[PDB]
Ligand SMILES: O=c1c(O)c(-c2ccc(O)cc2)oc2cc(O)cc(O)c12
Ligand SMILES: [Br-]
Ligand SMILES: [Br-]
Ligand SMILES: [Br-]
Ligand SMILES: [Br-]
């Protein structure tokens with residue numbers, strides 16, 4: 001699939017940089033024709049077949065195809081796509097309140113504050129999983145706040161760079177996210193399904209409640225070994241006044257066997273979450 005090949009600068013003015021990763025840089029921008037503001041994500045293309053620098057066209061097209069499907073208050077939306085020799089440029093919805101990660105670092109939350117974030121995350125993931133989309137990279141840096149200066153910030157899930165359609169219940173690809181947040185089936189290179197996201201949600205919940213990462217070791221290999229062994233516990237110093245029901249919720253997500261793990265529907269009916 002090809003994208004708009006006119007110069008993006010003829011239609012948009014860029015401003016402040018929002019952030020950058022290994023292959024992407026994201027800049028605030030403003031569309032000239034409407035005055036409306038967006039986030040322009042520049043993804044560097046691969047320069048040759050075999051290269052490791054840049055993102056393969058297959059991977060870029062997958063991300064764009066998935067983004068085109070989605071319209072939900074808790075997930076980032078796609079406005080337009082441009083490209084030139086060097087980059088594909090995604091014009092995305094602007095979410096300007098920063099990462100949930102940075103929000104956590106500036107402030108543990110109360111259980112109310114934690115569940116207020118978590119419920120939005122669950123709703124976004126319920127939408128995605130209902131469309132058979134696995135995100136595969138859920139973590140606090142991929143949750144963006146609309147406005148961080150309100151008591152209950154609204155959030156949107158971003159970064160669909162590892163996302164896949166799961167049309168046969170599982171996928172068997174080169175898929176590996178951030179060690180602190182990946183499920184054991186990812187660590188063990190096994191077929192992956194929607195269940196992997198639910199594990200990541202368990203890790204996020206543990207962090208929201210305690211300010212500590214449940215599997216984090218001194219090196220990435222230690223973290224991955226910890227994940228595979230389900231080597232986590234609820235430290236009393238962090239969890240002494242946390243409700244047992246919140247611990248139960250986490251415990252039913254951080255389960256090695258993806259078949260016994262709570263699904264997104266299970267998580268919405270769980271007594272800690274259900275109204
Ligand atoms: O740093 C990042 C970032 O800030 C954003 C972003 C911010 C506001 C938005 O409205 C949309 C995206 O996305 C990203 C996507 C990546 O793949 C890598 C990144 O580093 C970021
Ligand atoms: Br700006
Ligand atoms: Br579902
Ligand atoms: Br993070
Ligand atoms: Br994004």
Ligand SMILES: [Br-]
Nearest residue numbers: 179219220223
């Ligand atoms: Br690590």
Ligand SMILES: [Br-]
Nearest residue numbers: 129194263264
């Ligand atoms: Br699910």
